[PDB]
Structure 1
C-alpha cells in the first residue's frame, strides 16, 4: 500500500556510489566509491550481521530469549550484531581488543550488548580466542563466527556485488576492498567475475601487518582490516593480489576525504582510497572504472588516531563572551 518499511532491518543495503574528482586529480582513471555510512548502524557490517543471524534462525540453531550470541569483532560487526540482537531479542556478548576506538564500545552498549575487552597485544587473534572460551563456558550460547561463516561472503555475493554491477551499468573494471573477514572482497569479487571475467579484484591489508603477503602480524591503525590471520572465508583465488597500505597513509587519506571531498569516513575508507589511487597510476588502468568502498562513518573514530588530536583540541575549547 505504501513505501513505509515494516522493519528497521529493511533499511539495510542498496547504498549509493559517487565519483571522486578531487583526491583523484590527474590520476587518469574513474574512481567511484560505495557509501556504506547509509546503513542503519553506519557501516558495511549491517549486511553480514543480518545475513548470519537470519541464516542461523532459518537453520533452527538459535532462539530469542534462550540463546546467548557471542561474536569477536574490531567494532563494526559488534555494533551491527548488537543492533540485530536488540531488534530480535537476543542476549549479545562481544569480544573486542582494547585498542579500538571508544566510540565502538559505547555504541555496542547503547544497543544493550555486553562487551568484554581483550589484551591489546594479542590483537584480533586474542579476541577470537576469548570468544571461543566464552562460548565453551556459556550454556545455550552460539557464535556466528564471521571469519568462518559462509553467509558472510554470500550476502556480498547477493547484494553488495549486484548493487555495484547494476549502478555501474556493468561498466566496473576494477574493484578494490580492504580485508577484515574477507567477506566483502570475496563475495563482491566472485559476483563481479561471474558477470565479466575481465574484472580485476584487489584486496588491501596494512603494511604493518601484511600476513596475506607472507609478513608477520603486528599492530596497525587500520581498524576493520588486518586481523593478523587468514580468515577461513577469504577467497584468495578471486583476487589479483593483496595490496599493502601503510597505517599512516590510510589515516592521512581519511582526513583529506573529509576536508576535500566532504566525506567523513573511517580509516579503512582511507586505506581503500589510497589503494584505488595507486591502481590508477598504472598504465593498464588508465581510463578504467575503479570502484571501492568507504565501509564506515568517521564519527566512530573521534577517539582513534584519526581524529584524537582534533578531539583533544575540541575538548579544550571554551566559550567567548557575547
Structure 2
C-alpha cells in the first residue's frame, strides 16, 4: 500500500516570529524517519529497485540520517541494510539503526566521512551489497528537485528572496536551488552553509567540527554550484546556541544542523529588507541529540 511513498515529504513551513519573522523554516522532522534524508533515500532505493541492483541488499556510508532513512525503508521493503558511520556521530543514531534492524559498522572519527565511504566500498566487495552512493547519485538531487523544491515554491506563495541550506551531500541545495532559480532567476539568492572549522566550499581545508550532518570534508560530486550565489560559514557554538534558542523561544525541537541553518538565515535576512522572506530547512529533531545538545 505504498507506506513510505505516502509518508515521506509534504512537510510544513513555519515563520520564526519569536526570533525573526523574515525567517521561514521547513520542518523535515515530520518525515517518518525523523529527517530530510527520507526523501533522497526513497528516490535512490526506488531507482536501485527498478534497475535490479539490490539482490544483495544495501551498504551505505552515513553521518546518521541517510542511514536511518535507508534502514527504515529497507525494514519495510525487505532489503538488508549495512551502514558505515564515524564513531563521532551521536549515539542516538546507533540505537535507532539497531531498532530498525540495520547492521552498523563504526569507522574511525579522525577519518570522517571519507573513512566511512572507504569501509562501505570494502563491505560492498565482500558482501555484494549495493552502495547507493549519496555523494554521487543523481536521485539525491532529484528527490529535492521533484519534492522539496516544488513544496517550498508553493508553500511560500511564490515569493522568496533567499534560500539558505547547509551542504552535507549538497542534494537539498542543488534540487531546491534548481527549482527556485528556474522560477525566480536572479530574483532569488541561494546560500550554502558550511562549518567555519571545515570551510572546503569556501576554498579552505577540511577540519574537525561538531555540526553533525554538514561539512563532509570534501566537495560532493552532486553539488550543483551553478545554482549557489554564496557560501556562509557558521561556528560550532553558534549552531548549538541557535538550536537551543529554537527550542526555548519557538518551542521547536530541532537538531544541530537546524541551528546552523537558522543562524545562517538570520545573517542573510539582516543584510536585507524588513519584508524579506528567507527560507531554510530544519533537517531533523532535537531528541536525536540529547546525548550532546
Aligned ranges 1:117-128 → 2 under 5 Å: 117-128=106-117
Partner SS for 1:44: coil
For 1:286 and 1:59, how far apart are their aligned partners in 2? Answer: 50
Aligned ranges 1:135-150 → 2 under 5 Å: 135-138=124-127, 140-150=128-138
For 2:2 and 2:175, how far apart are their aligned partners in 1? Answer: 28
For 2:183 and 2:33, how far apart are their aligned partners in 1? Answer: 30
Question: Which of 254, 263, 286 is matched with 1:265 structurally?
Answer: 254
Q: 1:20 aligns to what?
A: 16
Task: Note the C-alpha offset of 1:173.
Answer: 1.6
Q: 1:44 aligns to what?
A: 36
Q: 1:316 aligns to what?
A: none
Provide, for residues 59-104 of structure 1, a one-character-per-residue CA deviation record: whole Å limited to 9, x for no partner: 2222xxx322100000000000000110111110000000111100
* RMSD over equivalenced CA pairs, Å: 1.1
2:193 pairs with 1:201: no
Q: 1:215 aligns to what?
A: 204
Partner SS for 2:33: coil
Structure 1 residues 6-15 or 234-243, which shifts more?
6-15
Partner SS for 1:151: helix
Q: 2:22 aligns to what?
A: 30
Q: List runs of 5+ in structure 2 lacking aligned partners.
A: none
For 1:131 and 1:6, how far apart are their aligned partners in 2? Answer: 29
2:225 pairs with 1:236: yes
2:66 pairs with 1:77: yes
Q: 2:84 aligns to what?
A: 95
Task: Note the C-alpha offset of 1:134.
Answer: 1.2
Task: Look at both structures and tell me which one has the larger radius of gyration over its CA atoms.
Answer: 1
Structure 1 residues 169 and 55: alpha-carbon distance in aligned structure 2, compared to 1, 3 A threshold: same
Q: List runs of 5+ in structure 1 lacking aligned partners.
A: 307-322
Structure 1 residues 8 and 53: alpha-carbon distance in aligned structure 2, compared to 1, 3 A threshold: closer
Structure 1 residues 182-191 or 209-218, which shifts more?
209-218
Q: 2:49 aligns to what?
A: 57
Task: Note the C-alpha offset of 1:216.
Answer: 1.1
Task: Note the C-alpha offset of 1:6.
Answer: 5.0
Partner SS for 1:141: coil
2:105 pairs with 1:113: no
